[PDB]
Amino acid sequence: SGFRKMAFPSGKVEGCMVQVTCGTTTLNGLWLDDVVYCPRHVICNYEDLLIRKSNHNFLVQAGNVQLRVIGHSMQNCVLKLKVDTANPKTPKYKFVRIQPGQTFSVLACYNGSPSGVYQCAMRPNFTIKGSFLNGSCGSVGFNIDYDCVSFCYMHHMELPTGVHAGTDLEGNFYGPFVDRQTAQAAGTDTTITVNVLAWLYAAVINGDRWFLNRFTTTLNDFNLVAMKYNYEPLTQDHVDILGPLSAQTGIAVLDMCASLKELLQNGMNGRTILGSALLEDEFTPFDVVRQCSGVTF
Amino acid sequence: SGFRKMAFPSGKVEGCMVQVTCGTTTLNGLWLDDVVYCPRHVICTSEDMLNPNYEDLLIRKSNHNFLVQAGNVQLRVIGHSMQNCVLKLKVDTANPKTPKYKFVRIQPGQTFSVLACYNGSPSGVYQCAMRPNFTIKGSFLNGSCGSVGFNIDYDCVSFCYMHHMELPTGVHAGTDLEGNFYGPFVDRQTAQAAGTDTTITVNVLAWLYAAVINGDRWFLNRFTTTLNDFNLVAMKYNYEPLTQDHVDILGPLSAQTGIAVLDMCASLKELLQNGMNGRTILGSALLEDEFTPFDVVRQC
Numbered sequence: 019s020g021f022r023k024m025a026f027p028s029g030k031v032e033g034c035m036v037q038v039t040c041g042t043t044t045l046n047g048l049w050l051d052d053v054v055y056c057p058r059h060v061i062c063n064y065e066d067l068l069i070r071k072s073n074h075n076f077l078v079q080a081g082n083v084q085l086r087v088i089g090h091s092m093q094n095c096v097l098k099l100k101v102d103t104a105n106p107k108t109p110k111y112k113f114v115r116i117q118p119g120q121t122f123s124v125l126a127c128y129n130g131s132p133s134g135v136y137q138c139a140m141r142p143n144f145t146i147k148g149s150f151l152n153g154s155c156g157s158v159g160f161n162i163d164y165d166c167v168s169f170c171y172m173h174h175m176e177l178p179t180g181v182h183a184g185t186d187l188e189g190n191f192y193g194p195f196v197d198r199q200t201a202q203a204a205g206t207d208t209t210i211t212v213n214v215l216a217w218l219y220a221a222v223i224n225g226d227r228w229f230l231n232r233f234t235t236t237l238n239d240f241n242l243v244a245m246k247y248n249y250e251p252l253t254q255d256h257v258d259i260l261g262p263l264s265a266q267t268g269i270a271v272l273d274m275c276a277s278l279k280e281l282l283q284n285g286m287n288g289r290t291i292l293g294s295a296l297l298e299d300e301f302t303p304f305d306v307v308r309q310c311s312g313v314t315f
Numbered sequence: 316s317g318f319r320k321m322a323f324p325s326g327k328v329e330g331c332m333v334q335v336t337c338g339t340t341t342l343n344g345l346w347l348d349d350v351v352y353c354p355r356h357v358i359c360t361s362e363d364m365l366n367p368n369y370e371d372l373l374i375r376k377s378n379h380n381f382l383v384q385a386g387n388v389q390l391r392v393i394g395h396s397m398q399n400c401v402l403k404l405k406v407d408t409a410n411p412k413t414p415k416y417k418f419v420r421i422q423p424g425q426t427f428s429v430l431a432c433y434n435g436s437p438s439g440v441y442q443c444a445m446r447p448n449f450t451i452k453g454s455f456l457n458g459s460c461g462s463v464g465f466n467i468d469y470d471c472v473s474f475c476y477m478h479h480m481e482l483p484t485g486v487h488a489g490t491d492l493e494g495n496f497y498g499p500f501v502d503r504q505t506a507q508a509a510g511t512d513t514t515i516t517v518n519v520l521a522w523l524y525a526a527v528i529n530g531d532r533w534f535l536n537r538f539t540t541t542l543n544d545f546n547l548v549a550m551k552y553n554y555e556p557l558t559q560d561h562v563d564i565l566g567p568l569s570a571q572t573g574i575a576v577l578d579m580c581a582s583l584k585e586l587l588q589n590g591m592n593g594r595t596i597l598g599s600a601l602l603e604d605e606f607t608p609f610d611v612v613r614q615c
């Protein structure tokens with residue numbers, strides 16, 4: 019038993035992290051096969067500014083070994099450096115783009131050296147609530163599936179409120195952000211309803227049951243409450259995804275929605291759920307299944 | 316900026332995990348050089364898990380009764396010995412992925428990363444703390460025994476915990492890597508319970524300093540307190556006593572923020588009397604006690 023914010027084992031990703039230096043800027047790159055991927059602002063009109071640069075301007079260090087750059091190109095907001103050596107530690111991988119509400123692990127790195135791992139959710143306003151200091155640009159987000167690494171995030175900047183924004187590995191930003199020193203702010207965020215419900219199921223599976231009640235609701239009635247408290251809408255697809263947790267616990271989703279409705283309207287009356295005094299929304303339904311059934315990689 | 320329960324990257328530990336089977340019992344082992352370390356209850360026969368005589372059981376085993384698998388490879392056991400509650404299997408091949416490592420026994424309040432594993436394979440990584448009652452609040456299912464806890468400050472892996480059991484409140488107990496249990500527990504299924512747990516006061520203070528470093532001030536006050544008056548209050552909320560060692564340890568965060576340690580203690584006193592009134596600190600509506608003063612400096 020027990021329930022913790024759990025990240026994927028990071029070893030497959032650790033073997034791909036390198037240090038990239040251009041002039042006096044140093045940040046992290048992802049070495050896969052014979053290409054190194056990193057944020058394009060390492061060269062700081064990127065188009066005009068990339069043509070001036072040449073191959074030996076980019077210093078790539080894998081541990082204590084230098085890679086030689088034999089080509090470079092830009093794709094959206096990511097820089098791609100072709101190197102003369104394929105990474106022998108390249109795992110099975112693919113590039114994916116995730117949706118708001120989905121979770122992933124972040125490997126936070128400095129000077130090409132991994133330093134910590136934590137689990138995050140892509141917020142509805144397309145930020146992540148991470149922990150990043152100077153030099154973390156190029157740190158990466160990922161999920162693991164059977165034996166495949168899905169890379170989904172690369173860090174580019176911190177916003178004034180202290181949250182973080184980045185791109186997918188194809189260089190497209192998540193959210194309404196740009197990579198340059200202009201005034202930018204995180205939009206109003208909302209709570210990921212389907213994830214809160216999944217975490218309430220986790221609580222039940224772990225014996226924390228006090229918030230359960232005899233009542234049920236309708237998707238319509240509950241969504242009018244959700245809107246009222248800045249909760250994301252709950253769709254029929256969301257209901258269906260929670261189906262395995264409903265069957266395992268005996269609590270139908272709209273029965274659990276009645277519990278969540280009361281928690282919103284009335285609060286926690288001084289109690290906690292799974293050691294938290296707030297409603298947690300960074301576990302997906304799949305995260306709860308995986309942790310409570312012991313999936314391995 | 317930002318403050319997150321960060322775990323250490325787990326790759327150096329992943330390369331050491333193996334599966335160990337004896338009879339019908341399978342659990343995880345830790346393969347370092349030519350030794351596999353695992354919990355000694357892998358030898359326990361299904362019948363007597365209440366009062367097993369582990370010394371008697373082990374002498375009756377042959378090397379070939381122990382099946383050790385690394386990935387798709389079977390390792391040959393060529394000897395065995397027991398050290399306290401840990402079984403040490405000598406194998407005929409040194410692990411080529413062995414990192415720089417040491418074994419350390421930690422004190423209550425210290426934090427570490429757990430790599431939870433099943434059948435020799437990693438499932439996930441998370442941060443834990445050794446509670447004052449010598450349990451940890453982990454996430455462990457059947458087959459997780461032999462998963463380890465570790466820190467990786469500056470490229471050397473310090474192994475501090477190996478998982479053995481779950482107690483009735485749903486908390487977890489285990490040993491150091493020399494096989495000595497943390498706390499009064501034994502690796503038998505006789506009735507056992509953890510003591511009343513308490514809050515790790517020095518870690519709460521470290522986290523309030525982290526909050527101040529991240530721009531939060533709303534809980535500060537103009538008061539100061541004596542160490543003695545603070546401990547008399549803390550007691551009544553089941554908080555651990557604060558010692559002069561803890562005060563010394565908070566010195567650097569006190570310097571970085573300009574807030575004296577006993578000034579911050581008076582803030583904590585007030586929080587214990589009022590609650591948070593629907594406010595949060597570093598994204599939490601509870602006082603967090605599983606970040607050490609060291610963790611705060613590492614991250615800030």
Ligand SMILES: *[C@H](O)[C@H](CC(C)C)NC(=O)[C@H](CC(C)C)NC(=O)[C@H](CC(C)C)NC(=O)OCc1ccccc1
Nearest residue numbers: 356455456457458459460479480481502504505506507
């Ligand atoms: C090893 O993978 C496994 C991990 C658990 C998290 C499931 N550990 C055990 O099975 C362990 C073996 C014994 C010989 C150390 N047993 C326990 O952890 C056991 C709980 C199991 C049966 C779920 N705990 C236990 O026996 O605690 C003592 C006790 C007995 C009776 C009443 C209260 C406490």
Ligand SMILES: [Cl-]
Nearest residue numbers: 420421422425
């Ligand atoms: Cl310690």
Ligand code: NA
Nearest residue numbers: 231233273276
């Ligand atoms: Na209900």
Ligand code: NA
Nearest residue numbers: 536538578581
């Ligand atoms: Na004060």
